Amino acid sequence: NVDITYKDQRDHTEIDKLRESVQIQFNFTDVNIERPQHRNYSQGNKINLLPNKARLCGLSYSGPVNLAAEVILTAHYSNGRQEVKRASIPPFQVSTFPIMRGSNRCHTHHLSKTAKKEIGEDPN
Amino acid sequence: SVIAPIINGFKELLKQTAFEELTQRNIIEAFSAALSKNTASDLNRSMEQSIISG
């Protein structure tokens, strides 16, 4: 939960002279991680990325991490009055997190031994 | 490579655009600019370099 205050150095308008600093505040709301995915190069949606494909292509078996955020900033003037603005952000993919094989977020979790053998994995 | 880029991006947003003229659009634009490909690349490269270096 970042909460920091930064002095502003904008000196163009008289209103810009009536200000002291910016009190920055924001927090993150929703976190989700989904199974690793591939692009397939057709300008569509993202398709499942299997471990053998990542092995052969030199990819990373990383699953997307989705985040939400809330921005509430505060404006300080010279006299001592405060202005607060708020911002709501919809879900947004921050990055990809590496995924462990055999884990719950891996593709080889619903698969049985025959399916794992069929898709190119070591079934044992 | 997340909070410090956001801080510096806010510093540069304040260093060009007036704060009283800023609205929610400029707040979103500054936050999204502070989260460009540079920060994601820095964070992922640093984490993987850490895991593989030990």
Nearest Cβ partner for A15 among B7, B20, B40: B20
Residue A32 and residue A64 in contact, taking contact as beta carbons nearer than 8 Å: no
Method of determination?
Answer: cryo-EM
Which residues of A, range 18-47, sit inside 8 Å of B by Cβ? 19, 22, 24, 26
CA gap A38, A88 in Å, rounded: 29
b/e per residue B23-48 (b: at least 16 CB within 10 A)? eeeebeebbeebbeeebbeeebeeee
Residues with Cβ within 8 Å of residue A37, at least 6 apart in sequence:
A46, A47, A48, A49, A63, A64
Closest to A6 (Cα-Cα) out of B48, B1, B6, B45: B6
Residues with Cβ within 8 Å of residue B3, at least 6 apart in sequence:
A2
B27 contacts A85? CB cut-off 8 A: yes
Closest to A74 (Cα-Cα) out of A89, A86, A63, A84: A84
Sign of CA pseudo-dihedral B28, B31, B37, B38: positive
Question: What is the residue-wise DSSP string for B16-27?
Answer: TS-TTT--HHHH
- Name residue A5's beta-bridge partners: A23
Question: Å resolution of this model?
Answer: 2.8
Q: What DSSP designation does A61 have?
A: -
Q: Is B6 exposed, middle or buried (0-12, 13-18, 19+ CB in 10 A)?
A: buried
B4/A contact by beta carbon, under 8 A: no
Residues comprising chain B, all counted: 54
- The token duo for A51 is 């471990």
A15/B contact by beta carbon, under 8 A: yes
Contacts of residue A89 in chain B, CB cutoff 8 Å? Answer: 28, 31
